[PDB]
Design a protein around this ligand. Structure first.
Ligand SMILES: *[C@@H](C(=O)O)[C@H](O)C(=O)N[C@@H](CC(C)C)C(=O)NCCCCNC(N)=[NH2+]
Length: 214
């Protein structure tokens, strides 16, 4: 169970790695393949040298995969899942991703590490891939938060309105980044999540500039 869970992710991690090697350049086939397992698997997130290396889910709601893994089995750690509002094909300004932080170096435990500049330095880039392209996540802000909204905004009203969001995001960061974001760029937010009804004013958020490298 608690070790079978690592078995599954191990299997899958190794599976994904070979797919990303067989087809290489092409990404369309790697996910058409993962979709056989579960049609709700819409992407992959990986950070080399860490345990952050999982498939990303998406359901009709934001609690669909809270306590479910990629093969739809109940698990306290659920899955890493995209906001039910976000778009796979054509990204929104801000694509949100959520995942647990139970403290055993799995799922989104690694987000906490980004609160240290040192760690940020050694890990400025996170890989994100899906059925439509390869992307590179350029981390530029990491912080702890008590609020439950605002940083959960998919699309925006206008450049002025969006400009503010980027500015606050930057102001809230507890680490210095040499990246440069603008109302032009699209961003991705990584946030931790507690079980449903599991009150906790402590959340960790990581925001990055989304670069399509394909
Ligand atoms: C954990 C998190 O990181 O926020 C989890 O996704 C969550 O608490 N989400 C919010 C909802 C949106 C950010 C508005 C929440 O109210 N928690 C319960 C699940 C949300 C209910 N379902 C939907 N579709 N809003």
């Amino acid at each position: 169970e608690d070790k079978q869970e690592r078995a599954n992710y191990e299997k899958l991690q190794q599976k994904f790695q070979m797919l990303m090697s067989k087809h290489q350049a092409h990404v369309r086939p790697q996910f058409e393949s993962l979709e056989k397992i579960n049609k709700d698997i819409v992407g992959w997130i990986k950070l080399s040298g860490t345990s952050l290396n999982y498939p990303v889910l998406q359901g009709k709601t934001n609690h669909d995969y809270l306590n479910l893994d990629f093969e739809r089995e109940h698990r306290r750690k659920g899955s890493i899942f995209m906001d039910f509002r976000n778009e796979l094909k054509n990204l929104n300004h801000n694509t949100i991703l959520y995942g647990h932080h139970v403290g055993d170096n799995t799922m989104f435990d690694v987000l906490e590490d980004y609160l240290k500049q040192s760690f940020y330095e050694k890990h400025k880039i996170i890989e994100f891939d899906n059925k439509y392209g390869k992307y590179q996540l350029q981390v530029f802000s990491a912080y702890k938060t008590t609020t439950k909204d605002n940083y959960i905004r998919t699309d925006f009203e206008n450049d002025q309105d969006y400009q503010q969001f980027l500015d606050e995001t930057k102001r809230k960061s507890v680490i210095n980044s040499d990246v440069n974001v603008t109302v032009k760029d699209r961003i991705m937010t990584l946030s931790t999540c507690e079980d449903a009804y599991s009150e906790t004013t402590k959340r960790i958020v990581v925001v990055a500039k989304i670069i399509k490298v394909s």
